[model samples]
Target chain A: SSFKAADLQLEMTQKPHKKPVFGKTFTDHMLMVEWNDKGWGQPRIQPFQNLTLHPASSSLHYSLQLFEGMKAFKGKDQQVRLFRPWLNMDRMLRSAMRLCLPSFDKLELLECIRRLIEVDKDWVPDAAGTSLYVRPVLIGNEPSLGVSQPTRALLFVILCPVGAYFPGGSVTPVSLLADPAFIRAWVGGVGNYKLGGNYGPTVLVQQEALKRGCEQVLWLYGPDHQLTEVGTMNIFVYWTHEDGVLELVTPPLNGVILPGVVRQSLLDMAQTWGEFRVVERTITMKQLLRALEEGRVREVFGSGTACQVCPVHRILYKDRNLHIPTMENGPELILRFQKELKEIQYGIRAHEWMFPV
Target chain B: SSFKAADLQLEMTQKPHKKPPLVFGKTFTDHMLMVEWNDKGWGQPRIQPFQNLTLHPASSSLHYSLQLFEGMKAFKGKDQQVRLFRPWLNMDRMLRSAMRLCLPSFDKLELLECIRRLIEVDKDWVPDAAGTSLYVRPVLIGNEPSLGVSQPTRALLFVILCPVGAYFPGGSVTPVSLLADPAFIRAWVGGVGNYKLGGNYGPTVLVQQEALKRGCEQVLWLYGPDHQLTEVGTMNIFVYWTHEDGVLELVTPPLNGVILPGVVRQSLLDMAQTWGEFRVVERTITMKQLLRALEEGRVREVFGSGTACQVCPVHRILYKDRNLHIPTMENGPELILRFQKELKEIQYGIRAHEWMFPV
Candidate 1:
């Protein structure tokens, strides 16, 4: 039973396209609800109306907000379902904590999500690769024109029917930029949290990277220049240790990098399946260069909620061409993780992780 | 000529009481004009009745935008004319800046101020003390969502009136909290340029003479600091010191501290330098030696400026229990000179700096 049974209405809208592109287009109706400091206020399910905001609202002015990227899928039975929504809810709670937003009953929010989807069920794409992308965002709604942390907030959810992430069929790796001039996070900063404030400042730099013909940024930090994340995704390096042992390395959640949700699940699966020394530690650029020189480098990849995983085929560092031989050798462990995760997500494997509503 | 020539429509409703009370309680007008902003473009100016704003914009949903506050005044004519002190240019520049939504602005901004003054113009219940009385403020609004610094591509501005006396209405002797926090820049590097950015990380400490109340965790540099001018007129402070050998002392915080450039700050510096030996230096604070001197009782009384400046006296250290007793003072030679320059500039100082004002 969703929150709809409790007097809240779920506004529904069909995508204008028979097969809509992801995230760009909107549906006829959307969900927008405000949550006060106390608890969930009247959940408003209305027509996807344009918003009128105060120029002084803290969220807009201060960037005190967070968002969750998720998807609702249609299973073989033709029933709309969500994939690992609990994880997204968990992450959203963490984001709210970091963003200084008011708390809510997780179960109640889950109920609200179900209610929203139940109403917008018709918009969920039925194709195997297609899914209704959900963006659940929370912002400080306090109207007081002050700079302090808002004692109030509003949480709302919107869904978009997304097409296949890889339109060209098989996954393609992207090039990386290793410029240290644009540092993403620093110690004692709010990098560990999923705040919009964290991402906004980096957009211009990233856009510059794209202009330079780089697909994504390989976020580097600290004096030794350690690799943090690749293009907003948790970065992992598969390399043979100097002592001839194989290990997998990813940047640890040391308060300097974001603790990505997908990053965590990958570690769990690698430990259970690979039975190798999977490490969550700082791997610097110097180390990568040394590994490449000694031929110890195996594969380098990135993980995020956006895609299950993305491979890094080449790295453009200071006008040097550094290529990863992952494609020529084999599909690598990251590709395997994506296969397993996607299978479970589409209800093919029906793992306990999948929640059937 | 103001943007709204016909709308300069001045109307006054005086208070029944011969004298107007201090504070912002009383609103002088019935209507306020406001213009809103969006991704598509700015909406029409509505002379809406004054009321709480109802904004549902998406940016407000997730980001913090550039927000600003401005203070201005109005004077009464011998012929009972209620004239705003050089408002046309400020309104014009504020609106033009609105086109680049990084800074917010409104179309009906001047009308709002006019309305506010019209409501209280008759009450021009001018103060007896020098620079005492009503202070009007215009606020250019910032982000509520989409916390990015791009041309919000959206914005708005408003003007509110507050009746105030001298910022330092009482005596002049006062102390302030000189915070030396390295981690917190009042303005960040590559951040909002000393603009009236809405998302200000307000100093936890107060500016005063005595010790600050908020205890420091770790100052990357010093502790008992030297006199560092943090803010004046909400701009950076310009403290005048008479040194040995007839040398004059004028010190202000460096732009490193993100000192807001104020009309008063510039006026004080330029005015004082004319006399020579008034070495104007912009530098950092000293923690260790200053605290030691305070123990030895060599610390002199301090003063600052705000729109309320006539000589704002500091009474308490933001966190310290100790109160400050300041010397009652007036704008000195340097201050007077700078005041003349600043005043003239804002008034489109002929034979002077006209760019000083928004004109």
Candidate 2:
């Protein structure tokens, strides 16, 4: 009754590892299923290949697509585990409903992906930093140009081995260009949802940031210039409050911030520690700049599935260079959360978040 | 030397039309025009049998929504000549849309030449019936096989044709009902709404469904806390109202980085200014101001202009839980019908003009 996995097929013998340049190096197998207006079909895990799509598919024309990013880690004990797969499942369902795509049983979909990870267990790298990136994408594949809700959809999961962010074994801070000209999201918009439409327009501005001598964009929102996100990651800033207490803050998921899985995990882990104020509140670039001038700001970093926590060292705002003191402060909380999450991820510390394959 | 039509290749086929009543986007022609762009340059333009496309699972178009499209039509005149109305405008908008997405750009004239050639090959599909034309859909999508969010090095530009029936259907121009609500926004300041990008269209579909569920035929997208009316469905909204200054004027929101610069919108503005009959104003219009004008009976007419609908009048608006009746069709809809007649004249080659490009 649940999706049948015995129908899975292996096309060829396994090959050695391919070089990872973010999403370039892919694993051998992939999982796919078709969904009509009636219901979803049984998932089939087959060899990685191209997709046969109608020329007027909804995804290509209307941008009716969404993707989830999570990772599979191979611990020091040579065991593979996924970190909170159900969270990704729930978020993917939310994105699908927002896009008017069909829904599926969350645990049942995860069951197929769980088996997929088990089948591709060898793809999970053994090195200290390398691991298989799990990308689950849902797309409206209906063949029509009517420009309305699609009748059919395709949900597929593909894995790729991502190389270490710090291949030289050192965490480096990134320089940011904070430009108010480009807003990644807005109120009354699908910014909280992980839709493909939100990402498509940002690449042009991201290139603009690079041309201006910045590694990533520190996306600001509204007339207040609130710090929304960093490039594709949820942003975090650790600083001393005006009352002299330390606080770690990030933007609230108020339809303007994509509630990243790692963002939630960091909040969960920090609030559990109970050492300082862990706040999910709006932090503007003005406040951060003021704090920088006042020497009250301590650390600023970004969180995502790719690099757990990437520290920020400087920002270029309004043609002025403002240096961030995160790396100068040893990025205390930044490294702390990174180490803590890595411990749980590598299975060095037992936690309920890890779902074993 | 770039994107030449002389290097075109043809491998066509035969397929009969299949439809009873004509539809908008359905019932395509037998052949399609295709060209691919890589790091080197665009490949030779080819005319092949209309078929499905094969793309990588990680293609940027499917994943990142790196896609854009243009809509124009080719009409068959009584003289049996096929003509396209103001195709250069669609081509210009298409090139701008491509540049907005950071996709590789192409020579607009060369692509237009290729399209004219495609229409020549499928000239049979240009319906000879009155009030019918072959709708042309020029599309470009990122075909790169990478998952990362970056400018796609590879792109596919293709053209598809569909035989469409008259929008008004024998001169019975129906007025559309609109649901004007600030709860749903179509575009935003600093967003990609100014371009005909795929992202701009995706969110509007959901909102249109909302409007339908609310018993409205289309959506009147309002922006900002001031509740400024931006656009009507996919078309540019125009208001013909007696101004508080006692001058009759036609007003539309200025292109202040928000509304799409539609081709038909430009034609209406150009023709109205050339007539110099009523004052042509490009500024903002809010719902409160519109409601007040409706109360004072200062409103003359309200209509939307676009490539497909030309100029459509609005009968009623469902805004703030009140059905504000707009007397566009009631007051003769004189100027509105004038733009419609002028456009259809230039489009069907009934009037003498260079806007119609013959194939």
Candidate 3:
């Protein structure tokens, strides 16, 4: 109910001389809305700046925070397009509910974000394969040191222009270290939610993976060593089935895996094309290792907002290196998905999921 | 090796006018200790007037929970001297937590000495009540603006002091109601539970609110089908019981990376062993074993220990809607009273173990 766009304060800042490094620099404007135990306050768009917070803010002490990542692409037709942004909004609402934070009108907040983007539309990168990265963060800022429901909350959105996630804009495959000793999420934990608590604990484990000559961590969960995720992305496996059929398989959303927007988009796009079988089911390390042994594994990749599609080169599990063919020979399916996703994102292909800002 | 106390900026500020509310962590003193870290090294420490921090909107600490904290206390004895209880242990544990958050470390000894000086500067804020003490909170945060999760390129450590009374109401013992739900797990094997990370605390807040709704004071966290007791609220739990052979024994969960090794938990164990009245042991106690002991009337008393609450006796356990009463007026909590008395005596300079540094 609190929308005051007429009072928006714009900071006429100079444009970036060149494309920014991914997530390194922010644009001129941001959207912010605050709420408390009573209700939400007026939504405001202002200059992107540092946040002033009380020293005992609950978000800093108890990890009462959630965040969403999305991107907006400037199409070849000189139009700004947002790829499946409503899905991010929906997931963000669910995350807010899970953290016991006060909820907001989703459509209103999304409209406010759109307005902020329109105000700073010049910041949207027009280069090929480049887009504007949007990061929305919600935090509990209650100053009380007591661990209870947060009385105050802040939701802010910041935009950044970036070309690619990996250096040199190369969509290279990455090696994964699958260690059963380090578990990422449990059945009852906050793994399914895009909560900040879920990410902080993974930093040390990611460092361990890098130390072992692996690019990303292959998060294994449970006693059977079920593969859950790969470096903040949803994992997918393409293989020739034992029945001589081809299929794409990913871990199911059974409270363990994050229901990623990119993951859902790929599944829907594949199902609509009606090419091969698409699966949303559990695929354990043992099943995957057996597929590799029988030479049935085709291509394995990860999907997320950071990198639309990331190919997998090797998996180090139980001291054995299971080399994936996608690294050297290139993955045909991954390339196709990447190309089509980019086309849809850049408005080369007409899709209802893309919204013009 | 960052002992640059000469560079500390002093901010002469007014002390609190009246005694702070007994509610824990509600009020703060005038000054706080702050130090920033860049890629170069740790910066100089400063004692500035308490103020809000202007951090990057996308700081990693806000988005990624890259933060940890430690709790300490400074007491005033009858001889009008300040005694800090086991501060070195708190500093060592905080360093471990900082490493877990992938933040840089500083000289712990230097930080402790700095904290002592800050307390001296704000010594008047320490309440004169018998059970009141100045609570010290040290927090570390990563201030990098980028979303990429890695070793934080920038870090800040801030310490705040607040006066707090006894945790329980009127400083009297109260029993806790235990809810044994397998859904809400505090820490798991291989989880960073031992470290005082921020993530381990937020998930329990919902459960705590639910407990409050059900008229329970705190939560009794359970794990697995075996129901190994992990913690009570934010403290380590202990039970005094009679074994099958009729020997009086005390049971605490083993340090399986879930239970925090509190300073008072160890002190109580040492004191009980010295008394030679009962057996003090660290062993896993399943719910079934506990239920059987209760049925046999062999369970003496159940309690929790922490710096905030020296000993919290449990009266009723609301397990599956059936109330198990261990009322206060029932059996005398001899050991609990003994532990509290010894701790207070040491804190108030009645014993030689107390350390006193007069301002």
Candidate 4:
């Protein structure tokens, strides 16, 4: 078999006995696959360790790198499940192709990750509201300074147990600094791809938001200041139209918005329910402000793998704090979506979305 | 004292006997300089044998691109004296780049001394042939073993050297053609293009290959729909043209948010300003203006400026299915030639200038 899971050279360590922070703690084992001129080599799920790379590796210099963030959930019945990993597989392969890194069998990669999870099954936390965050990173490690296509690449995966994206696991609403001085993404950019280039530049802007007493960045683009994304998540606005139609709107995937798997899942679930007018259309700042002025803004939330649904309460735009009624809790859509996704992930509600490992 | 150059450890043994391959950056010297930064500030600087780095799989540099670098050159002059050209400029840019990525900074003088010692230790590796020099690459990476995108507590700053031959194989300079497409802009108004961040360049690789497919050498990065020229390939772009009022001028884009402040770009601006040329302007010029100028026979020559070529002329551009021929060659590229000659004189220590730091 191309995916020789039995030949995996495993070196396990004692699982951590303390509380885990988001992206800080790691599982005992990791998955590594190499790509050379001969194409993808054997995949090894060895002990979690540091990578030995050439100093001139393209990834460290030119950022010829990309990553996918997914999670493995533990059910109350002591079963392990992965929520729609195929989407991550597709995204990772797309990222590889965009960077000109070699690709692999997506299903086979999912199987390798499944085997890795099987190896570290005990590391998956069982406590309520806890999951193991899986990060698969691919990089071009060619030892050349020329901006040419890399013949060598590295694809590795690491796991960490995380409670929530934000520190406290409470329903804490977040405020955003929607300043146009800093833009997170733009048209004809690589924002749609979950590449390393996308996240690095946002840290300083994140600090800027913190300095302005906000929690996240509400990314805007174009002269119209169309709302695109929130922090690293897909933003959604559940509002009542001036004509009294309840519509849930998020930005369309028009190149700049990262087609996040969680974003897709939420859209799919909401659209299937047909309780509201689900629209994937552009939401400009002017339109949202008008909705808020008319008291039609029902709720605003962000969706991603880290936190299934993160509630957004306030936005600081153009030197003023525009408060939303989502925090004092108007509609239960955000909470309901979070519970439903968690239920599916924990295998409480059986669906084809949850792949049993 | 904070950098602790005296506490440096030397691990030297093997040295290459033959001339290293004349490749640009593929060949490396025998020794390198590395230092680890932690909560206690920088640790002992180590001059270890050149080798691969050990990084965590979750290292932020590998994921979120928390990295920055500096490009410098140490020239082996005719008198056999080693010299570095305006290396402090690179040092300053490197510090600014590190700050942009939230990496810690270092004393520029201390790091320079450490690099000078490194060049001395591997002085034999400095190529002596004409148009040959040792390329100095200083890279700083975020080594924190976490997936969260934030300031790195554990970081590594390392300096690597490579003996590079002439950018052009012969004494003759070859002009590069560019694909000026607005679909693929290199940097944005609010992006980190002014800083030499890794993310600023990763996207350009594919776009460069796209140029290759279109029979072009590089990309002419345009900013807005007005087609304001930002850069050619990775270098700053320049044009020598006679204005509509018949005044000849050398114009380049200003240090806008999307432009990389190149070392050669600064040197050219400095030299031209001193020469009291017809006029040296740093402002935006759109493609429409350039096309109109070309139509009116006001365009003289165009070129790109960077550390690699100093001043590389432009011969043609592929834009919107039309090949706009640039007259950099036919017009003799008068200013481009002069700029290249003066930079070479300064770089090779032929002309005595304070810009050259002798070792």
State candidate 2's DockQ.
Answer: 0.79
lDDT of 4 by residue, B11-92 (tens): 8857543543476779888888999998889999989888889987889889999999989889988888899989989989
What does candidate 3's lDDT look like per residue over A1-357, in tens digits? 343445444554455334345678888878887777557777787777788888999899999999999999998798998888899989998988777777776777777788889988888988767889999999988887888889888999998888756566567889999998777777777789888888887888899998999999998987778888999999999998767889998999988799999999999989999999998878888888888889889899999998999999899988889898875546788888988998999999899999899
Per-residue lDDT of model 4, residues A251-275, tens digit only: 9999999998889998899999988
lDDT of each residue in B77-153, candidate 3, tens digit only: 88878888778788889989888778888888788878887898888888767788888899998888898887889
Full ranking by DockQ: 4, 2, 3, 1
TM-score-based ranking = 2, 4, 3, 1
Docking quality level of the chain pair in candidate 3: medium
Score candidate 1 by DockQ: 0.20
In the range A176-213, model 1's lDDT, one tens digit per residue, is: 88887666666545567666655544555667677888
Evaluate all candidate structures by whole-model CA lDDT and list the values in order. Answer: 0.56, 0.87, 0.83, 0.87
In angstroms, how far off is B113's CA in candidate 4?
1.4
Q: Which clashing pairs does model 4 show?
A: none
Clashing pairs in 3: B175-B315
Score every model by TM-score.
Answer: 0.71, 0.97, 0.95, 0.97
Cα displacement (Å) at residue A330, model 3:
4.2
Candidate 2 residues lying further than 4 Å off, grouped into runs, are A1-20, B14-20
Query: Model 2 Cα displacement at A290 (Å)?
Result: 1.5
Question: Could you tell me the TM-score of candidate 2?
Answer: 0.97
Q: Report how far residue A112 has shifted in candidate 3, in Å.
A: 0.9
